[PDB]
């Protein structure tokens, strides 16, 4: 199945992505970059005061519908 969840940069700008429980982060990554034009390895996504790591399921953090993640820099 599909549901939508928010990003949100530190400009305040939040914006829509549709994913899917079992998608790993790194495929999350990947829905970014076509959205926003942010390469993977560009980003890091924050959700409950953690780093979220990639091989992991949005489904393994519990991350539910119309949540918001922190989208970050990485440098």
């Given at each position: 199945g599909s549901m939508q969840i928010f990003v949100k940069f530190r400009t305040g700008k939040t914006y829509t992505l549709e994913v899917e429980p079992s998608d790993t982060i790194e495929n999350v990554k990947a829905k970014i970059q076509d959205k926003?034009?942010?390469?993977?390895?560009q980003q890091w996504l924050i959700f409950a005061g953690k780093r979220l790591e990639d091989g992991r399921t949005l489904s393994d953090y519990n991350i539910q519908k119309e949540s918001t993640l922190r989208g970050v820099r990485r440098l």
């Open positions: 926003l034009g942010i390469p993977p390895d």
